[PDB]
Each structure stands twice: as structure tokens, then as C-alpha cells.
Design a binder for this molecule. Structure first.
Ligand code: NAD
Ligand code: 4PI
Length: 268
């Protein structure tokens, strides 16, 4: 027992109890992992949420757009897990795109300054995070990031889709670098999940305009999924991420694992 028994995994991206990163952390601990969490901006509020996990764990601040945060990351993580110890896993569950580039706003009306910001946080940070943490990762390690299949365009997602396409490409290169440390790098392309952020997006940025398309688009996942899809349950996704963090997918890297009920393999 204990899928991640005796493993040191840094999990990023927790902002609310609905965050995918929160469920990844939970299942991870339930499987015997010692976690190190990173938060952005409102650390106090994050701490409130994190304290609801199965076990306690170090919470460090990390704004992936801040050079010093990334420059001190390794040292700060080492102080947290104790000198002489290294990380066995890294979870990147960070994403962002201003309303201008994701929602009801026209595709052609997104200022690059906004798009660039979204790509910085959603894609480039996967590499900067890898750079800061690879030096303190043990062989057999695993870096995992969250993705949303951008192989085909769709309503509303717009520039966040572009950001995910960049992410998938960044992951392939991070895998080359990571390989030098005996570490694997992969993405988990999850089906739609009703996280607070997602729920806000779905509605708070479309009203009754795109609300239709997004409703249909959304309903399509469960229809297409041979084993169905429950947008209100992040657990299957969290389990998939822990699977990549374990030693049971030792020959897979620079890849993408789809945790979407099999929806992307079906047309109707
Ligand atoms: N919600 C979905 O249906 C869905 C589907 C597929 C993939 N994903 C991906 O999963 C990840 C998390 O999704 P979520 O719905 O749980 O989102 P939210 O927590 O619920 O997660 C986004 C995280 O981004 C963090 N963040 C934003 N800017 C940051 C910065 N500069 N530095 C550090 N952190 C920053 C936030 O603080 C937050 O914790 C994202 O990469 C997202 O694109 C989500
Ligand atoms: C902070 C943050 C977190 C996660 C995302 C992220 O991955 N998006 C969220 C809304 C999703 C909406 C949906 C589109 C099609 C069908 C069903 C639902 C699309 C993907 C962006 C920003």
C-alpha cells in the first residue's frame, strides 16, 4: 500500500478547495507522500485551504513571474524538506489568461500584452519551474503539468487554447532537459472540471451569448466518453497525476496522458 510511499512531491497551484491541485495533493498524501506546497499572492487564504488536507505540509510563496521567487525556490524548498534531501516529484497546476483572451471577448480583440502574460504563466513557467527544481530532484523523478487538449479549436477557450498548445511543446523540451537528471516530464490532459476558476469562466465571461456553445461543448464530454465524464469529480484526474508521479509509468516522458473518460478518442 502507499502508491507514493516515502516520496517528496512539490505540488503547486492551490487557490481554493476546488482547485485540481488541491485534489492532487490530497490523493498524493493519502498515498504516503510528503508534500511541499507553493502558493501565489494570498498565502494566508491558501494556508486556510491547505490546512484541510489529510496531513500538514510546508507552504512556500511562488509567483512564477517573479525572478527572485524562482531563483530562491530550490534553496527555500531544501530548507523545507531538509538539507541532504531532494524532491521526487513536481506538480505544475498553474494557469491563467486575462478575460480579454478567454471567454466571450472576440478572438481578435486580445492585446498581446494580455496574451503574453497568459502564456508566461501558463506555458513558459513549466520550463522555469523545471529549471529551478531539476537540480534538487532524484533520478526516477517525475514532473507533471496540467493540460487541456488544444489540438482542435473550440468556442470561448480562445487564447488559453494557444497557451496550452505552447505548453505541450514546452513539455517536450523540458523532457529532454529532465532526462539528463533521470527525470520524466509529462502532462495530464484532463476533461472539463468545475473548479471555481472554471465555473467563473463558464458564465461570468459569457452570460447568454456564448453560454450556449459552452453548454453544448461541455455536455459533449460525457456524451463522447465511453465511460462517461463527471465534471464535478476531480479525483480521477488527481489519481492519473499520481500515476505519473509513481514508478508505474517509468518509460513515458515528453508525453500527454488523457484523463477525460476517453472523450478525445471519440467523434460522437
Ligand atoms: N478547470 C478545468 O476544467 C481544467 C481542465 C484541464 C486542465 N486544467 C488546468 O489545470 C490547472 C489548474 O486548474 P484549476 O481549474 O484547478 O485552476 P485554479 O486553482 O483552480 O488553478 C490555477 C492556479 O494558478 C495559480 N496562478 C496564477 N498565476 C500564477 C503565478 N503567476 N504564479 C503561481 N501561480 C499562479 C493560481 O493561484 C491557482 O492556484 C491549469 O493549468 C489549468 O489550465 C483545468
Ligand atoms: C485558471 C485557469 C484554470 C483552468 C483553465 C482551463 O483549462 N480552462 C478552464 C475552463 C474550461 C471551459 C470548458 C471549455 C470547453 C468545454 C467545457 C468547459 C476550458 C479550460 C484556465 C484558467
Amino acid at each position: 500500500t502507499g502508491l507514493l510511499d516515502g516520496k517528496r512531491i512539490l505540488v503547486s497551484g492551490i487557490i481554493t478547495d476546488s482547485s485540481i491541485a488541491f485534489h492532487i495533493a490530497r490523493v498524493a498524501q493519502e498515498q504516503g507522500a510528503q508534500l511541499v506546497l507553493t502558493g501565489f499572492d494570498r498565502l494566508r487564504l491558501i494556508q486556510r485551504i491547505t490546512d484541510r488536507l489529510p496531513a500538514k505540509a510546508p507552504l512556500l510563496e511562488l509567483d512564477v513571474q517573479n525572478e527572485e521567487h524562482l531563483a530562491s525556490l530550490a534553496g527555500r524548498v531544501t530548507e523545507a524538506i531538509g538539507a541532504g534531501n531532494k524532491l521526487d516529484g513536481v506538480v505544475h497546476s498553474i494557469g491563467f489568461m486575462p478575460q480579454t483572451g478567454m471567454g466571450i471577448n472576440p478572438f481578435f480583440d486580445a492585446p498581446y500584452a494580455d496574451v503574453s502574460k497568459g502564456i508566461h504563466i501558463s506555458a513558459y513557467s513549466y520550463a522555469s519551474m523545471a529549471k529551478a527544481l531539476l537540480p534538487i530532484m532524484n533520478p526516477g523523478g517525475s514532473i507533471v503539468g496540467m493540460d487541456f487538449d488544444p489540438s482542435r479549436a473550440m468556442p470561448a477557450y480562445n487564447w488559453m487554447t494557444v497557451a496550452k498548445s505552447a505548453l505541450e511543446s514546452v513539455n517536450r523540451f523540458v523532457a529532454r532537459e529532465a532526462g539528463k537528471y533521470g527525470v520524466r516530464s509529462n502532462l495530464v490532459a484532463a476533461g472539463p472540471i468545475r473548479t471555481l476558476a472554471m465555473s467563473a469562466i463558464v458564465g461570468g465571461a459569457l452570460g447568454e451569448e456564448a453560454g450556449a456553445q459552452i453548454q453544448l461543448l461541455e455536455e459533449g464530454w460525457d456524451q463522447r466518453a465511453p465511460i462517461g465524464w463527471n465534471m464535478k469529480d476531480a479525483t480521477p484526474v488527481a489519481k492519473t497525476v499520481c500515476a505519473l508521479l509513481s514508478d508505474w509509468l517509468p518509460a513515458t516522458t515528453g508525453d500527454i496522458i488523457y484523463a477525460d473518460g476517453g472523450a478525445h478518442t471519440q467523434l460522437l
